[PDB]
């Protein structure tokens, strides 16, 4: 029926947490913090406190990351990269094309005012803006070959100057192109020249792309203008047990078992209702406000725990309204059918416990 | 697969710019390391990849080149830097060393 | 620092089994894959056989001519690499080296070498 | 089929069968025009210009006439989703016809969109054509500065052959470049000969974008442009949808509407159609539910968890077959799981109360002696 | 619930875990046996898959886990995963020479070969396409049309060529900037070749991109190009149906007898469930991920069998840049199977309890009647 | 049609509060933001202060130089407007205008005006 | 920002074509309206946006121009339409009027 009083109850649900981000079993997580994922991978100038970190349990990001891409542009296939970067155990940053002796015929000291650091203009740390020297922009063709049984992430960019006078003063050509070819890839980008509204006081744009090499494959670059050549790459090493979580909680030094975007949980109660998104081996999520069983129960919780055993909630582009509504329909259904299964079991589990002792009294009555 | 080299011996002054080249038969995708062999002693590694540097090596050692034609350049050579150097691939399994050059 | 001391070299007849040995100091033996390089008088440097770490089930790869005559093992607990030879030949008089690979994604580069032992027949 | 003394039937299968009002606000009776024909101002859809307020959207199952000039509407299926929740927009002349274009001909018409026997064109676009044999570069702009989104539509024209292109825009390699602060594209014509559809060979490709407050959009083109003449200042909302139906209208006033009628009852469950608009009972895919006569509170819990859905089958293109089967499978499972959940709940519920009544007299019989 | 591992008196297992382990026919109609081949090769007429041409009607499509040797000339089948879905329901096709090889092209060359598609030691090409090349050093504009006067939806395929360098393009098509335009009544596109040096795959530095489109009754398709065209030579006449798909398996074939099929074997039983595999083709009952289900001594559990119906679990392949897809689809498939095993577990964990109390009530009533 | 009647002006010493009122008739006051506009003798038109409807919680934007001395309120029930001035100066001898905003998406245009009172200082 | 205007005086005959230009200082995206103030009386609104018309305004009033160069063309002048005309921006917060010309 309605709310009732019972002698001994154990609330499976838990609605209390320390409320602090902390260590997950002993490995400190990556803390992007004041910087975004797109800014971090490209090596934003004000994002240089994470160059040393190369091992994590999960990745954090503030709700409104202030600065990422310092130079305005459109990161192509952004939402797909976050999915591939969620399950990376640890990578290794190596200089794929050394600045000293990989571009000896061009100019590599190119900076812009929109990426100022300490009051001085700079650029990214994982990219190299090429420009002609002496008045010539020679044909470039650089090849790479991955031969170490590890996928390699490669990023580059294409430049779209605001007008035409800009182009011939940098690359000395009218119709440039950039070609990237692999064993299972092919593209041919061309610059687009038009006037755009100012963003960050710049009328130009730079589109950033990426590709994921495979062991034994070869990637070949070719361009005669408007190329932002790579300087560093990443040797990925896929793993499990991580993800992107948006949070603003302070950091602290403890040792928990799992993590939720609002805190960590140290308890053995089978259920929780703080948040469905979590990382680690820790209790499920039930949308009820109060769940209890009159004290069977240990087997009851584990009976439906196995069936329930990520809800990542992958971000979608602004032009994918059909996707998000499709995923919102899926996510809400699974979290509402499952909370009703556990709610109904309590009405059935507690009811059996009543006559379980009453029949004993009748059995005692016979005896 | 097979590595040739420059002449076996070179005569170097004190203050010269001595270069040595190690051209490969096939194409090694920019994996050509260098080594130094002190006389009557062990050996040491100077450069890996193509133009990177090893910790504890002076700044007057540097390389260049790509494809199947690499080089090593020494600037303002001293009297202590006398040894024999080789070149080694890192591309495929049967790692091939060099024919040796004496300074 | 990183030193490599080796011993076990001497004179033998062309039927014996001289087991060479090498020792290490200054790092962890469980995260590096080491090699074996020999140099005969008047002959350029060559390669013999490579032993990987536990990340490849202690896989062992061998040269072409040397194959079917040599075997290597890793004494991780004692941190002394050891090699065993058999069926010698008169074309195997050479100075042997104890080498370390080094873990970075710039191929294989063999950054640390030993003093070298003399084996003659 | 057990006989019962007093029964209360939860399921209901009664619908008026006529399109009624939704709490006092009339819908948008599209009639013979598709969404793609209403927005672009079809000449034979002039009765929907002034209806800038609605509750829900109706549409006949086979809309006769949409895009009068043959073409391919880019990202059509996404536009329906954005317009499926708009409360009420406001049609304003973004580029006035009289003064915006002084060096271009603005009186171009086509014979495939005839109106009352006279050839006409759309009412929200403007087929620009060179005057005096010249087509100067055009460069417009629009800065939205009143904290309301603006929906912009334009088009690109692909003439049938080379002869017609050089006779209109006086060029061979034309281009159109629409640029904003967070959207950039560039189009080109494709001069090819195609079979006849609606007695026409050339094609027109439509496009759209959704601006933001404080943003700007720049139009640039030296050929093949169908410039906008009207825009739409949107004002988003919740509680509206698109349905396909044929029922006639009436002056009634209901609370919920379904594609086959309207519901005028308060029983928890209905079976007229899975789709519904407004507050109304849930859906169960069976034909007989009854709780012998607590029960009222019990049905609330089923309703509470069930109250998360729109079920509007989003239309999908012909090149997105994996979309449809994935979406069809998702909707099929959810309704079938829920119908089985609601069916067995009653079957479990009655067995408890039947013994409750049996033990009630037995309780008195226990106290009888 | 509250008991565990109770010994029973007369049980009836409701789970089937035995399969013949053989690729058996369905309802007496032999299936299509791609076997060693691939779906890309079969449609494009792979040189090493000529034995499958004589088949016209089938019941389902078989394929080995790692089909060896399909697109012999390397390339990128555009929207490939979409086509497999359309072919996952086709009941029959009618290979008819849309453009006969003898008179359709009197002005070009038809005998083109590639060393990567060698047959019996001799180089050849596909059998459903036709590499076109000039004659006498000339490549005239071509213009072909086809009107679907068959009252069936006709499937069409063709290709474009991307030669390794400028020298290969000039020596074959005698041009610099060639274009291919394919226009239908409701389908328009304009292709262009891209010339670049690529890593060697199958010992060749070129590429061929295969496209396709699907027609309608009364429609018309127009082909135009001035170079870089791999002209069609055969088309298809699709005829739809129901209850078919692509299953991947390694089982041997034989002249068996069955009623349905599952990838690891063909099941012929009567229990309302099975747990061999999720994917199942034909008329055999539902699938419940479990280990042991039973009911102590028909219509008690026929609702689940009636509600579980209409579920095809063939995992549709997704591209490399679709990791947002598979995670969404794996979430859907995993959740549905896990929920359904909970409904079926408790649908018998409660009914069996009543029967135990049912017989107790029946006997105790007799004692009251006697006493 | 639309009538704006303004009253409440008169001479005042340069230290005392003075209040002006503008009347409205012929439309709906609830959905029309209204602004006050001052025109000095021999000088060009000037903007003073603007008040929005209940949609933006009665937002009260102000001019730059003429701040910290006015509070604008709307008596919707009485369909009037109230402009208050404290701590006047020697540059506030002018006629003051009642202006209606106008609801359409073509910017701001001030589609109606009033007769206008007078206000002097000594 | 600061809104300028044309010459402060003009004498118009009857039936002539007389215009007035109101050139701004910063780019206003076509939000320049025009007013008319009769002597000793009210002031009206003549044209909003750039070339639209207000209810009850005679068809002899129209404008043109875009960017920072506008006009208010007047044709077939009558004895009633004589007053001082002001232009007003509509872009940013300080909606600045114009100095106005005399007829
Ligand atoms: C709005 O829809 C109407 C019909 O729902 C469109 O009018 C239809 O236009 C087509 C061709 O434009 C006509 O087809 C032709 O009709 C003649 C006369 O019988 C016939 O001989 C031809 O073989 C051909 O079928 C059709 O008759 C006509 N419908 C009616 C009822 O007259 C109209 O074009 C649509 N408006 C717009 C702007 O698209
Ligand atoms: C149909 O399938 C067969 C087998 O899957 C394909 O033949 C295979 O082709 C590859 C590539 O040419 C052969 O590998 C090569 O072997 C030689 C000899 O050892 C070696 O020197 C090369 O480096 C390369 O590894 C492979 O042996 C061969 N398999 C057999 C059984 O002959 C065939 O190409 C496929 N059909 C078509 C049209 O592609
Ligand atoms: C990193 O983020 C900071 C804070 O968002 C950026 O600094 C702001 O820059 C904008 C213009 O670019 C200024 O209007 C703000 O006043 C700045 N904020 C502060 C606190 O000074 C910074 O520019 C970003 N880094 C880069 C390279 O863009
Ligand atoms: C991050 O950016 C903000 C700008 O709002 C600045 O105040 C802060 O000092 C920066 N650094 C950190 C560590 O928050
Ligand atoms: C450009 O590069 C080539 C080869 O890398 C080299 O030979 C040439 O000298 C370079 N250009 C100049 C001006 O040095
Ligand atoms: C570089 O590429 C351009 C583009 O085709 C070509 O014209 C030029 O000859 C190339 N340069 C060299 C040195 O080959
Ligand atoms: C819509 O089309 C039908 C089709 O015959 C026609 O009868 C009707 O007049 C058209 N208009 C409306 C408003 O129904
Ligand atoms: C086009 O309009 C501009 C003003 O926008 C004008 O200066 C120019 O003379 C016009 N061109 C022609 C050919 O009349
Ligand atoms: C018009 O556009 C064409 C091509 O975009 C360009 O060549 C021409 O200079 C433009 N005209 C003007 C006046 O800028
Ligand atoms: C396909 O490959 C298999 C490899 O197991 C081979 O035995 C067989 O002969 C090939 N061809 C066919 C038709 O199975
Ligand atoms: C091409 O074909 C036409 C007939 O279709 C023929 O008349 C013409 O001569 C052919 N071209 C050549 C070069 O023979
Ligand atoms: C062949 O096509 C080209 C491409 O437009 C055209 O220039 C040429 O005139 C055509 N040849 C004939 C004979 O029509």
Kindly state the DSSP code that residue A76 receives in the 8-state scheme.
Answer: T
Specify the fold of D7-16+248-368. Hemagglutinin Ectodomain; Chain B (3.90.20)
**Could you give the CA distance from residue A59 to residue A184 in angstroms, rounded to a whole number?**
30
CA nearest D61: which of D188, D247, D328, D307? D247
- Nearest-CA distance D279 → chain F (Å): 27
Q: Specify whether the CB–CB gap between E59 and E244 falls below 8 A.
A: yes
Nearest in space to G42 (alpha carbons), one of G84, G3, G78 = G84
Share in percent of chain C as helix, strand, coil (round to 5): 5, 35, 60
3-state secondary structure of E368: helix
**CA-CA distance, F4 to F22, in Å (whole number)?**
7
Tokens 């304009």: give the residue: E190
Whether A245 and A60 have beta carbons less than 8 Å apart is answered as: yes
Q: How many CA atoms lie within 13 A of E190 on its CB side?
A: 13
Q: Tell which one of E99, E103, E108, E140 to mutate to probe ligand 11, the residue whose CB is within 8 A of the most ligand atoms.
A: E140
Cβ atoms of E206 and E250 closer than 8 Å:
no
Q: How many residues does chain A have?
A: 367
Of A192, A330, A336, the CB nearest to D330: A330
**CATH class belonging to A9-18+253-366:** alpha beta
List chain B residues with CB under 8 Å of C64.
Answer: 94
CA E188 to chain centre: 27
Which residue, chain included where needed, has tokens 């024909």? D37
Pairwise CA distance, residues A84 & A212, whole Å: 10
CA–CA separation, D199 and D69 (whole Å): 10
Cα E9 to chain center, whole Å? 47
State the residue for tokens 């020298």. E167
What whole-number distance in Å separates Cα of residue E199 and Cα of residue A143? 10
Residue of chain A nearest C108, judged by CA positions: A148
Going by C-alpha positions, the residue among A138, A216, A149 that lies closest to residue A173 is A138
* Residues D308/A335, Cβ–Cβ less than 8 Å: no
G43 closest CA partner among F34, F95, F83 = F95
* Domains detected in chain F: 3-100 (2.60.40.10)
DSSP annotation of E269 reads: -
- Are residues E190 and D194, on separate chains, in Cβ contact within 8 Å? no
Q: D24-233: which CATH number, 3.90.209.20, 3.40.50.2300, 1.10.10.10, 2.40.33.10?
A: 3.90.209.20
- Alpha carbon A55 to its chain centroid, in Å, reads 15
Nearest by Cα to G101 from G24, G22, G30, G1: G22
Q: Which of C102, C105, C106, C107 to mutate to test the interface with A (most CBs of A within 10 A)?
A: C105
Q: Are G26 and F97 in contact (CB under 8 A)?
A: no
Distance CA D76, CA A323 (A): 15
**Of the candidates G45, G95, G100, which has its C-beta nearest F44's C-beta?**
G100
Q: Measured between alpha carbons, how far is E343 from E352 in angstroms, rounded to an integer?
A: 15
> Does D24-233 match D7-16+248-368 at the fold level?
no
Q: What angle do CA C26, C30, C33 make, to 5 degrees?
A: 90
The owner of tokens 């991978």 is A41
Which one-letter DSSP state was computed for residue D242?
B
Long-range contacts of E109-118 (CB under 8 A, 24+ apart): E109/E133, E109/E134, E109/E135, E114/E72, E114/E73, E114/E204, E115/E203, E115/E204, E116/E72, E116/E73, E116/E74, E116/E202, E116/E203, E116/E204, E117/E46, E117/E47, E117/E72, E117/E73, E118/E47
CATH superfamily of G1-103: Immunoglobulins (2.60.40.10)
Nearest CB among C47, C107, C110 relative to B94 is that of: C47
Given its phi and psi angles, is residue C63 left (phi above 0), alpha (psi -120 to 50 degrees) or beta?
Answer: beta
Q: Count the neighbouring beta carbons within 10 Å of the beta carbon of residue E299.
A: 5
The candidate with the shortest Cα–Cα distance to A208, out of A146, A155, A286, is A155
| Other C-beta atoms lying within 10 Å of the C-beta of residue F84 | 13
Q: With beta carbons less than 8 A apart as the criterion, state whether D133 and D161 touch.
A: no
Residues of A with CB under 8 A from a CB of C: 92, 94, 147-148, 150, 235
Torsion of CA E360, E362, E367, E368, to 10 degrees: 110
Residue D120 is inside which H or E element, if any? strand D118-120
The dotted CATH code for E32-237 is 3.90.209.20
Homologous superfamily in CATH for domain A24-235 = Haemagglutinin, alpha/beta domain, HA1 chain (3.90.209.20)
- What is the C-alpha separation between D34 and C37, in angstroms, rounded? 79
Four-way CATH pick for E11-18+269-359: 3.40.50.12160, 1.10.260.40, 3.90.20.10, 3.40.50.300: 3.90.20.10
Say yes or no for a CB contact (<8 Å) between D77 and A322. Answer: yes
Q: Any idea where the domains of chain E sit in the sequence?
A: 11-18+269-359, 32-237
- CB burial class (10 A; 0-12, 13-18, 19+) of residue D144? buried
For residue D92, list chain F residues with Cβ-Cβ distance below 8 A.
Answer: 104-106
Q: Residue A222, by phi and psi: left (phi above 0), alpha (psi -120 to 50) or beta?
A: beta
Q: What is the DSSP string of A114-164?
A: EEEETTEEE--SSEEE-B-BTTB---EEEEEE--SSS-EEEEEEEEE-SSH
| CA–CA distance, D96 with E332 (Å, rounded to integer) | 51
Cα gap E208→E163, rounded to integer Å: 9
Among residues E145, E111, E141, the alpha carbon closest in space to that of E227 is found at E141
Fold entry, domain B17-98: Immunoglobulin-like (2.60.40)
Contact A291, A273 (CB under 8 A): no
Chains that touch A (3 or more CB pairs under 8 A): B, C, D, E
**How buried is E7 (Cβ within 10 angstroms: 0-12 exposed, 13-18 middle, 19+ buried)?**
exposed
Which among C109, D300, A69, D83 has a CA at the least distance from the CA of B43? C109
> Where would I find the beta strands (DSSP E) of D242-300?
249-254, 256-258, 261-263, 269-270, 277-278, 282-283, 291-292
Cβ density class A3-38: b for 16+ within 10 Å, e for less: eeeeeeeeebbbeebeeebbbbeeeebbbbbebbbb
| Cβ-based neighbour number of residue B46 at 10 Å | 20
Q: Phi/psi at A253 (nearest 5 deg)?
A: -105, 90
CB atoms within 10 A of CB D221: 24
Method used to obtain the model: cryo-EM
- In sequence order, what are the beta bridge partners of A244? A59
Say yes or no for a CB contact (<8 Å) between A148 and C107.
yes
Nearest Cα residue to E157 out of E43, E72, E71, E49? E43
Strands (E), chain E: 11-13, 32-33, 61-63, 114-119, 122-124, 129-131, 142-147, 154-162, 180-184, 188-191, 207-214, 220-225, 229-232, 236-237, 246-248, 260-261, 273-274, 281-282, 286-287, 294-296
Say if residues A183 and A250 touch (Cβ distance below 8 Å): no
Q: What is the DSSP letter of E142?
A: E
User: Which ligand sits closest to the CA of A106?
Assistant: 5
DSSP A226-271: SEEEE-EEEE--B-SS--EEE--PPEEEEEESEEETTEEE----SE
């Amino acid at each position: 029926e309605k709310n009732v009083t019972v002698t001994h109850s154990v609330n499976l649900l838990e609605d209390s947490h320390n409320g602090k981000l902390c260590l997950l079993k002993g490995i400190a997580p990556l803390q992007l913090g004041n910087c975004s994922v797109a800014g971090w991978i490209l090596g934003n100038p004000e994002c240089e406190l994470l160059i040393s970190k190369e091992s994590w349990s999960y990745i954090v990001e503030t709700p409104n990351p202030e600065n990422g891409t310092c130079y305005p542009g459109y990161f192509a296939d952004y939402e797909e990269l976050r999915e591939q970067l969620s399950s990376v155990s640890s990578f290794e940053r190596f200089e794929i094309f050394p600045k000293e002796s990989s571009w000896p015929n061009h100019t590599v000291t190119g900076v812009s005012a929109s990426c100022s650091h300490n009051g001085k203009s700079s650029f990214y740390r994982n990219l190299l803006w090429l420009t002609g020297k002496n008045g010539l922009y020679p044909n470039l063709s650089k090849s790479y070959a991955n031969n170490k049984e590890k996928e390699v992430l490669v990023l580059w960019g294409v430049h779209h100057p605001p007008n035409i006078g800009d182009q011939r003063a940098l690359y000395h050509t009218e119709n440039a192109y950039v070609s990237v070819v692999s064993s299972h890839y092919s593209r041919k980008f061309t610059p687009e020249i038009a006037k755009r509204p100012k963003v960050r006081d710049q009328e130009g744009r730079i589109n950033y792309y990426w590709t994921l090499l495979e062991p034994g494959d070869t990637i070949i670059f070719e361009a005669n203008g408007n190329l932002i050549a790579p300087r560093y790459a990443f040797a990925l090493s896929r793993g499990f047990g991580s993800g992107i979580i948006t949070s603003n909680a302070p950091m602290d030094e403890c040792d928990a078992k799992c993590q939720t975007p609002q805190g960590a949980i140290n308890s053995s109660l089978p259920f929780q209702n703080v948040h469905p998104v979590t990382i680690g081996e820790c209790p499920k999520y039930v949308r009820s406000a109060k769940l209890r069983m009159v004290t069977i129960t240990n087997k009851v919780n584990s009976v439906i725990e196995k069936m329930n055993t990520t809800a990542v909630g992958k971000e979608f582009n602004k032009l994918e309204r059909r996707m998000e509504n499709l995923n919102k329909k899926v996510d809400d259904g699974f979290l509402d059918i499952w909370t009703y299964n556990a709610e109904l079991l309590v009405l059935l589990e507690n009811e059996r416990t009543l006559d379980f002792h009453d029949s004993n009294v009748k059995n005692l009555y016979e005896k | 697969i097979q590595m040739t080299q420059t002449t076996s011996s070179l005569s170097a002054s004190l203050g010269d710019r001595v270069t040595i080249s190690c051209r490969a038969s096939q194409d090694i995708y920019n994996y050509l390391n260098w080594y130094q062999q002190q006389p009557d002693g062990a050996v040491k590694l100077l450069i890996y990849y193509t133009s990177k540097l090893h910790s504890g090596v002076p700044s007057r050692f540097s390389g260049s080149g790509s494809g199947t034609d690499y080089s090593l350049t020494i600037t303002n050579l001293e009297q202590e830097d006398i040894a024999t150097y080789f070149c080694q691939q890192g591309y495929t399994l049967p790692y091939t060393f060099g024919g040796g050059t004496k300074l | 620092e990183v030193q490599l001391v080796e011993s076990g070299g001497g004179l033998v007849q062309p039927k014996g089994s001289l087991k060479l040995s090498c020792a290490t100091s200054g790092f962890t033996f469980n995260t590096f894959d080491m090699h074996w390089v020999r140099q005969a008088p008047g002959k350029d440097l060559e390669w013999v056989a490579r032993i990987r770490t536990k990340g490849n089930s202690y896989a062992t790869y061998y040269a072409a001519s040397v194959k079917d005559r040599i075997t290597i093992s890793r004494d991780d607990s004692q941190s002394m690499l050891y090699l065993e030879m058999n069926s010698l030949r008169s074309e195997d008089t050479a100075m042997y080296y104890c080498v370390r690979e080094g873990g970075h994604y710039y191929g294989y580069y063999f950054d640390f070498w030993g003093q070298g032992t003399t084996l003659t027949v």
